[PDB]
Amino acid sequence: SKNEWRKSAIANTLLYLRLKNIYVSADDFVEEQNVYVLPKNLLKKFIEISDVKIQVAAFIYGMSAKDHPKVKEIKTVVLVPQLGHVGSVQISNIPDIGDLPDTEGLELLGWIHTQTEELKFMAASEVATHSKLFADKKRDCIDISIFSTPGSVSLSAYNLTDEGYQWGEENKDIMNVLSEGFEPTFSTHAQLLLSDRITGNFIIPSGNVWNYTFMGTAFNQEGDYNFKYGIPLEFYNEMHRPVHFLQF
Amino acid sequence: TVTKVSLPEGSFKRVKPQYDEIHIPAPSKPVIDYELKEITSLPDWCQEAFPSSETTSLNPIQSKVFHAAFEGDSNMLICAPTGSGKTNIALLTVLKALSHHYNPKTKKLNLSAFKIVYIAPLKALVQEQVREFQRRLAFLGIKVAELTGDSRLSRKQIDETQVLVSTPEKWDITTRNSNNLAIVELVRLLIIDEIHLLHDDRGPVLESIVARTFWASKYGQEYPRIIGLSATLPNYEDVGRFLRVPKEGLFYFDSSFRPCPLSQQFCGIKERNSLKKLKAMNDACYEKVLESINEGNQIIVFVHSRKETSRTATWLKNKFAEENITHKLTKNDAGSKQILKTEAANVLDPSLRKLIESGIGTHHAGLTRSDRSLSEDLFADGLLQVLVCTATLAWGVNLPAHTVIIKGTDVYSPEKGSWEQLSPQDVLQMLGRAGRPRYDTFGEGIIITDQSNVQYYLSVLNQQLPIESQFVSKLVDNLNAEVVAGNIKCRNDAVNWLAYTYLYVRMLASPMLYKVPDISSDGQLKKFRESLVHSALCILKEQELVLYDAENDVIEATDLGNIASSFYINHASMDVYNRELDEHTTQIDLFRIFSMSEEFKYVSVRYEEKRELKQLLEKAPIPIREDIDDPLAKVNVLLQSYFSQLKFEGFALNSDIVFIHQNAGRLLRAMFEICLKRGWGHPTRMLLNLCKSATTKMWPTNCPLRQFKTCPVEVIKRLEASTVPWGDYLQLETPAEVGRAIRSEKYGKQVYDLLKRFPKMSVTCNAQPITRSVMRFNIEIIADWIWDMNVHGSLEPFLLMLEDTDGDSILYYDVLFITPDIVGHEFTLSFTYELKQHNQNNLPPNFFLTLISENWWHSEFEIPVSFNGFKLPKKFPPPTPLLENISISTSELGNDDFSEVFEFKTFNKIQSQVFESLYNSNDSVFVGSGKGTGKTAMAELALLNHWRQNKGRAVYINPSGEKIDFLLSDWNKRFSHLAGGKIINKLGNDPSLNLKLLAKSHVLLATPVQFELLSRRWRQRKNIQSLELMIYDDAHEISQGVYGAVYETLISRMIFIATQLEKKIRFVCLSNCLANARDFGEWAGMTKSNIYNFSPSERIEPLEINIQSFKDVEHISFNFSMLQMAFEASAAAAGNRNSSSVFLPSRKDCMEVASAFMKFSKAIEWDMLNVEEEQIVPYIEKLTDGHLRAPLKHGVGILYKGMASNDERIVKRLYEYGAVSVLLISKDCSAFACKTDEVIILGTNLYDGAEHKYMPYTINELLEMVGLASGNDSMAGKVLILTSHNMKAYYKKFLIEPLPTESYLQYIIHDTLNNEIANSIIQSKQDCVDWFTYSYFYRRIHVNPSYYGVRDTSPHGISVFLSNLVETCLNDLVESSFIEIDDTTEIISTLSNGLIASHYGVSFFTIQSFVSSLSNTSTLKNMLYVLSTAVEFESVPLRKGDRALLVKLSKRLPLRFPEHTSSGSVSFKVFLLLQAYFSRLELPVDFQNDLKDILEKVVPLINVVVDILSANGYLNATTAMDLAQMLIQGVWDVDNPLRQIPHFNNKILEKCKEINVETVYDIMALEDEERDEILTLTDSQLAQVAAFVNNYPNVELTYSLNNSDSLISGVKQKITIQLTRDVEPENLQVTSEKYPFDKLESWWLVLGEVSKKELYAIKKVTLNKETQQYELEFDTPTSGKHNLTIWCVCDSYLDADKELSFEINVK
Ligand SMILES: Nc1ncnc2c1ncn2[C@@H]1O[C@H](COP(=O)(O)OP(=O)(O)O)[C@@H](O)[C@H]1O
Ligand SMILES: [Mg+2]
């Protein structure tokens, strides 16, 4: 049937319950390298607006404190026009947010996204997309991968090596079967800390819609889009589905 | 169980094969003991009300009822046959009700006093009566309106109307509204039609309505007349009891009295199965139709559905052709057919036409409006023989037929989810069509039904089915609503209420039916009542609609119960909404919860429709978790359909869906209301849409061009597919551009117009931290649409929320109602919100502030509210505790003479801790204590200990010139003698005079403004420099605005002057409890040990503070419901023998509240004065102001600004003794210390028609009122505050924890800086920043920079801020030519334009404004306008409805306001009242005050005007001076000279004209015998006339030009002027009857050339001597002859001025 989504849409209502089980990938703390702090409220919201099956992604912007130049607090999650799939997501370009208020000296720290396959390393659609977005622009951009599954969410932060990037540049496209040249060693654990003592916020497209699944013709993947602070829409929000209200 | 129906004589039964029919003959004529009342016997106005009834007289029933109806005022119940003529009966009672208001002699008809309500069961009929009543009562010019079918706030208006025609439910919701209590009072006639509905399951609505009119009226005391209109049915007896009809007014009409008597017939179909049963009725129907046709009679067939009409009509058509078809086609083929077949063609569209050709019509709704009107009119005209109807015909139309057949009586109840039998009232409505009263000899009614039912419908049509109460079924819901209306608190209120129900009247009378336990034990069912009430209350408590304690017996009202009542929601449904609605509730869930509503309990998915339903359930836009088995899925899918307007085939289901939308609205709203209360951002936001979606019958995801009814169907479709954002289309401001996006030209110009009519807002919002925990948000909004009345209605409302960053937590909300006068112009909102602890420690990045149209899709506008640079202030340090001992005693102060003064021998607990520091030391001290702690005695110490050390001089400073006046005299009698010290008051209004008082006076009392104005030239004034002590009282008011700033400017200067002169000046600051005295005390220079500052709870007399919030009251000052509680508190004071005073925001409100208090006191046992009425009349005799006499008499005092002191003291004394129990006091008179036991502040809002809004009281304004409560012995005083919910939080908080005292100095810095510059205290720029460091502002911007607007927030940031603050200011100052800067780092020097501002106290902004508005050509009327715009007058009030009066006043005054400016401004008030002053018009006490306060401000301003114009060399400066005089004397320049003389009335003036006395000198000259005849005046009046006339000046003016022979053009020539009086004057104190302030005589020497309109020179002088002379200096004009003129012009008297013309030649 067409209505695969109906079942998923009902599912996403209970997606808030997955946040009684929040797991963060941890290893030995190294003060020689960075630590990324993700405000807990942003996580809670970002899951609440995600799908159970289809990938959902955003950029993260943040900045260092004075106390420690290596503690990068994430301040803002910028949700942008995009077209999700199972196991991959097509994302529009790094947003221009320069002209918004309170954006004084934010760094683009990277991206954050859902997935339905728990791994210990960045996968091949991840590496393709990570290179697509950041290859020629900002190499240190991390990837925060969220493994979201019934019961729980599990966060995992990665850097990408230059071999990773190069390999990703080679792959303009990714197929289900080809799986050529891939390495789990392409990516490296990055230090992520979830904190509840700082609260971050969202920046959303000005049109308000971030989910161009049911509008896949109008999705401009190099679109010059506008943005504002604001509360992000849910994945199957009526506005992401003009078409279903036409049948009715 | 068998209850056989008695049939009238002549009844009989025929047995037919298909159905047993049974027949009831038309009844015989009654005994004729009446005359049909011809209309012409009606009084002559009425007669119109009955234009062209065919009869021209009332029918039998109407005629018999006419006496009691129209000549009686008794309550009435009329039971009558179907179709008896109810309208005219209702009409008679209407006309009577009108009669009680209009005067029989007067042509004029009062319209505001009476409200008439007509309750009627169905909208079809409600509308019908509205049309009929409008037509008929047109001539009397009264409005008849259907009481509004949908909305609530727009009901407050519809009291534009005099006749309200409602359904029971709409009038139940209206009247159950706490705010509508105002208007229920005017309801004098309550007509309930179809009163036998009582028996229906809707009938309890009628019970609740009546129970409320009788039982809940209370204090208001006058019940409206009630007229019930009924069907003749058993228990009418009990019904008339239920609505308190006495025998005079009860009527019951037998079937004999039905005009056009009715014959009945009951076909009892017997066939079991559906196919054959349906056939049975068709045949049965055909026969009866045939019979009626064979007798030349017409016939109406009622069927259950709209499709039935057309199929029944067709069966007939065909069955008639199957045999004949001649019979109904036409009366005659020749006569009818061309007239029919013309008309048959023209408007007929459907299959209806092939029926109409056959002479049979169909008639239902959802049929073309023209198409059904043809049917009615063709049938009316004989051309159709048979109209086949749905039931609406029966309520809507007036279309009779001889015969009426009900086919079938099966109806579908969507409510009950099931098929059912016709209700009795439907059958009786239907049968009221039978029989044309004018034409037909009789009428016929045929019911067709299953035999089972026949017995039942027999009883109904034959007066034997009893009317019985269903009040229990709806008992829980209806009880809650009275609990919510606050009329029930304890369950005795509940068992009384129940006594006014029909249930009760009916239980007493048939206790077995209602299952009473034992009436003989229970008596009048007191235990039964109590038991019902109990069980009801418990199920309510169980569901959280109430709070109940059985043991205690307290009933309490929940917020949730309050929604249930207001939105008319079933208690069970409120339960479901309670449990199910969540912080994480979702769209998909809402639809479910909606569908869970009790209202939809019975909805079932029937087998047949299930296949179609599944089709829709799988195309459903919002997922449905529930099965297609489940009922919830149906309700859900149905509601989703309504939003998509889906076409439905099944009738069953289409009825179902209709049932849903008519409830969907107010259920979804109740859901919204709960989520908003509970804070849940996301479901609240979503619910608001569903609400929109159910109004607009469309979904969110649709561009709202579809929402304009007035858009074409194609244009939207192209824009919806084109995916361009909705808002995107809105941005374009060009009419061509909008058309290019559409891709159509002509639609592009019309849609541009529509676009501009789409609502939009602009919002800005900054935030101000008040404390750490409390943030204030200041919002500025512009509404940007162009109003259209058809498209927007009277208003468009707007939800405003401030929500957390997640967008899940509503932190504040408020609803904004935009109206056509509001769009386009900016406004401001402010509110506080208390940050949660989390956010207090780490501020979040931002909050959000959002505005959403309640009505208009995609008109949401939200903005982030940053906290980027912010410092929350550090938490309050604890207040300095009190050592426990009251030890100090007046004996402790050394001197014996001093001890006599204080008249209390022991010092206060608080006074004791201070006493040491105040009396012993000469240390500067700061005291912070609550009002009523006797800080005045603290001032007096400092004074005693000043003089005990033989010191020089002291100044006492208070803002309240009212307090200064009291406290002068108190001090002056007590302290005058303590060494021979002279204590004087300073009146501000003449600085020179004040200067002189300083020199005379040992102690001065002054206001911050007054003294600050004196003190500015201290460098020159040695008497200020030599000042030894200064008491700053109520110093907490430096906070309080421009004048607060001036208080701080003042206090800073004394420090700067002490510091500069190494002069030791004692500063004693008396003040309220501050929150943080450290900064304040430090700024005043007080050692940390001398800064006593106490908690507000410290005040010694114990005092309890009860604060009560109230809904929807922000809108106004106080509402009926609050007033009631005020009165309960005042009664509670009266019962405890305690005295209570009540605080009100105006004088009007004092009068209006008194009037309610008299009415309320009459309707209680306690109406006592507590004293005899003959003794009070000697007192009231004084009657200074008649308005006070009437209330005072009943035990109630009034205190407003402007009373006669007679009034004042006469009222105070009567309270003082204990004659009058209750005092009512203007917010203004709160200053007057008038102590009591209990205080009620009734409302906490002030209207200013400057910002056209209500504003809440400041905590000061409260503290000045809370400080009136005191205790007797141990007894604790009580205070009652009556506020809006939003305000309660702020008031409660800061009445216990002081409001931080910040600085208003940024707002007057221009004047401040320009001033200290002018007096050479500042000559550099560093000086300006140094200067700041002596301010309180300075100390405050470091501790709370964010409050001031400092983004940087760091000591560098702040320091930068300040320097930019001076620079910005200095810029403005040079740019407006107040100062110049020049190299010596640099020297700053004042120009004249700013030196004149420094000299008169007049603002920087005002001078600026004058310089631009003034010209060499300025008229007097102009200078008056210019004047009225001075920024000084912004303090002058604009009360509710002053523009109204002001306009009317405008009409009587000489000068029209420059029309090119607004009518609302204070500039307007100022403009006129100064004319009302010049034209000596009597003004209301409120404009008297306004004028006084206006006059305080004017002498500075007019002198500024004269000094501007003159500086610019212009000679119209003199027509300013004319104005200066007019101001002092209360006259025009044009007026007769004598008029200025005090007390010279027209009669005295007219005698002066007979004698040919013309001028004031003629009056000095008058002979004694002429004096004694003209001056008819009191010894005192003459005193002034004396005073005036002696003082009046006569001055001789002479000059000498230094060398008048050697005049060279361009040199500085000097002239010497000399001024000679007759005798050196006593003093220059001005005498003026009209000016209320002191004024020194001053004079302008003017030199100028008249021909050229040009002033060459000027000097201001005072002629304090028998002779004087002065030298002027002026530039000689061009060579030639020049006619020069000198003028000597006084500023305080008319006609006293002298002038001298000469000529000169220049070489
Ligand atoms: N020690 C005392 N004993 C009795 N009454 C006092 C004493 N001190 C002051 N009062 C009186 O109590 C009232 C409160 O004084 P007031 O100056 O109005 O207080 P505040 O200045 O704090 O408003 C006044 O009537 C004052 O005359
Ligand atoms: Mg005081």
Numbering used by the authors:
A (entry chain C): 2148 to 2395
B (entry chain A): 442 to 1825, 1841 to 2163
Give the authors' words.
The structure has been refined at 3.1 Å resolution to Rwork/Rfree of 21.4%/27.0% with excellent stereochemistry. The yeast Brr2 (yBrr2) in the Jab1/MPN domain complex is similar in architecture to the free human Brr2 (hBrr2) with Cα root-mean-square deviation of 2.8 Å for 1,545 aligned residues out of 1,707 residues of yBrr2, both consisting of two structurally similar helicase cassettes forming a compact entity (Santos et al., 2012). However, in the C-terminal cassette, there is good density for Mg2+-ADP bound to the Q-loop (residues 1348–1356) and motif I (residues 1372–1377), whereas in the N-terminal cassette, no bound nucleotide was observed. The Jab1/MPN domain (residues 2147–2413) of Prp8 interacts with the ratchet and FN3 domains of the N-terminal Sec63 unit (residues 1011–1309), burying 1,536 Å2 of solvent-accessible surface. In contrast, in our Brr2-Jab1/MPN complex structure, the C-terminal tail folds into a helical conformation at the interface with the ratchet and HLH domains. Superposition of the Jab1/MPN domain in Brr2-Jab1/MPN and Prp8885–2413-Aar2 complex structures revealed a steric clash between the RNaseH-like domain of Prp8 and Brr2, which accounts for the mutual exclusivity of Aar2 and Brr2 (Galej et al., 2013).
The U5 small nuclear ribonucleoprotein particle (snRNP) helicase Brr2 disrupts the U4/U6 small nuclear RNA (snRNA) duplex and allows U6 snRNA to engage in an intricate RNA network at the active center of the spliceosome. The Jab1/MPN domain from the C terminus of Prp8 (Pena et al., 2007; Zhang et al., 2007) forms a complex with Brr2 and strongly stimulates its helicase activity (Maeder et al., 2009; Mozaffari-Jovin et al., 2012). The Brr2 sequence showed an N-terminal region (∼470 amino acids) of unknown function and two consecutive helicase cassettes, each containing a helicase core with two RecA domains followed by a Sec63 unit. Here, we present the structure of yeast Brr2 in complex with the Jab1/MPN domain of Prp8, which stimulates Brr2 activity.
